[PDB]
Design an enzyme around this catalytic site. Structure first.
Site: not given
Ligand SMILES: Nc1nc2c(ncn2[C@@H]2O[C@H](COP(=O)(O)OP(=O)(O)O)[C@@H](O)[C@H]2O)c(=O)[nH]1
Ligand SMILES: [Mg+2]
Lengths: 12, 385
Positions: B16, B19-20, B76
């Site tokens: 989280d 990445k997605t 992961h």
């Molecule tokens: N406020 C804020 N929310 C983000 C940002 N980048 C992603 N999101 C939040 O952080 C979380 C990351 O989700 P995700 O992309 O699925 O995570 P991953 O598992 O690393 O791929 C989600 O709940 C998004 O709403 C950011 O730069 N700022």
């Molecule tokens: Mg993700």
């Protein structure tokens, strides 16, 4: 090798 | 234009971290700016299909000069499996690190695996950079990564870091969407175009083999890469001592050819080679482009129970077959210091010693099997000899 469509094979 | 350079990228980093959210932000912002299919978070977080069971997504995005195949995985576990089996192909990797949390465990783990499997280049996208209004801080969060990437031999001092927010951009706040594009610029500039199979030196994994009274022996199989021209020298590497030999002819479907190229099945005639001088597991190769090795360091993934893997763990003295290209050879394993058993579903560093030598190099994949039944997968991370 020895084929002719797509098997393993040959000649030389 | 029409069909230009194809480059395979992916997103990695601790959970989280975004990445997605970045993948989506990319399909979109890029789709807008340059034109193409766009996609959003909600339906990119889905973890469908598989093949080589991995939870992954796929998306294609374009830049004025390149077409990109991007891969993003939920957790992961899916990344480990993908990078080790090689299912998820990456010419480059986008390491998504939240400026909030900073370099976390899985982040290091991915940089590590990345080096163990061959990921050639790593670009960093410092995300969640909107939640931080500091200037001297994101100065560290970056020097953390620099230092870290360097820990595993990635040019951290030269690695492009992009401060952004896969959210602010993704939604429409162009101000940040500008980062999605700057990132895209590095994909184009920092990630070199992948060399096409034919450009690489000649490698032919031997399948069938038979002799030719006056001339010698012909071996068949598919050209894995390179080009074998009639008249050039080649080597037989594997199992026995390497041998030299000239190619006095190539044939396919009974038609003799002047050359055999990658992606094709052919027959090569070895001048002066006796049929008993050829073993299965051997390859034909441009002279001195690959050598026979019997010991190597690998990163392997043991199939879990729910993937048809073994229902029970294995211990030291475990001696299975390592399937390489055409045949599975026997090898003994040396486990990490203080590692007693390897559980189904686990992934570990493994030093293997084969009873017969096989042609290889860092990056070679192989299967771990039992009775012809595959139970594991791996990649050579370092030929020790
Ligand atoms: N406020 C804020 N929310 C983000 C940002 N980048 C992603 N999101 C939040 O952080 C979380 C990351 O989700 P995700 O992309 O699925 O995570 P991953 O598992 O690393 O791929 C989600 O709940 C998004 O709403 C950011 O730069 N700022
Ligand atoms: Mg993700």
């Amino acid at each position: 090798s020895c084929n002719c469509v797509c098997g393993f094979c040959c000649s030389x | 234009e029409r069909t230009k350079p194809h480059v395979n990228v992916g997103t990695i980093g601790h959970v989280d971290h975004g990445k997605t959210t970045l993948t989506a932000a990319i399909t979109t912002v890029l789709a807008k700016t340059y034109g193409g299919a766009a996609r959003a978070f909600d339906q990119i977080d889905n973890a469908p299909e598989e093949k080589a069971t991995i939870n992954t997504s796929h998306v294609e995005y374009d830049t004025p000069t390149r077409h990109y195949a991007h891969v993003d995985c939920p957790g992961h576990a899916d990344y480990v499996k993908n990078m080790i089996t090689g299912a998820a192909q990456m010419d480059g990797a986008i390491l998504v690190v939240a400026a909030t949390d900073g370099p976390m465990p899985q982040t290091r783990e991915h940089i590590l695996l990345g080096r163990q499997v061959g990921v050639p280049y790593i670009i960093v996208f410092l995300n969640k950079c909107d939640m931080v209004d500091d200037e001297e801080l994101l100065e560290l969060v970056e020097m953390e990564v620099r230092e870290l990437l360097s820990q595993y031999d990635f040019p951290g001092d030269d690695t492009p870091i992009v401060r952004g927010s896969a959210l602010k951009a993704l939604e429409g706040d162009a101000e940040w969407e500008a980062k999605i594009l700057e990132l895209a610029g590095f994909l184009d500039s920092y990630i070199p175009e992948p060399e096409r199979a034919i450009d690489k030196p000649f490698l032919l994994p031997i399948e069938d083999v038979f002799s030719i009274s006056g001339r010698g022996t012909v071996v068949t199989g598919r050209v894995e890469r390179g080009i074998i021209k009639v008249g050039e020298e080649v080597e037989i590497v594997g199992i026995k001592e390497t041998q030299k030999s000239t190619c006095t002819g190539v044939e396919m479907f009974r038609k003799l050819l002047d050359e055999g190229r990658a992606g094709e099945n052919v027959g090569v005639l070895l001048r002066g080679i006796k049929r008993e001088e050829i073993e299965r597991g051997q390859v034909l190769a441009k002279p001195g482009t690959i050598k026979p090795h019997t010991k190597f360091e690998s990163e392997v993934y043991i199939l879990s129970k729910d993937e048809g893997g073994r229902h029970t763990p294995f211990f030291k003295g475990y001696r299975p077959q390592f399937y390489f290209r055409t045949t599975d050879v026997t090898g003994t394993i040396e486990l990490p210091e203080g590692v007693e058993m390897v559980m189904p579903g686990d992934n570990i560093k493994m030093v293997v010693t084969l009873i017969h030598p096989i042609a290889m190099d860092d990056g070679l994949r192989f299967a771990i099997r039992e009775g012809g039944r595959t139970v594991g997968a791996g990649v050579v991370a370092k030929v020790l000899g």
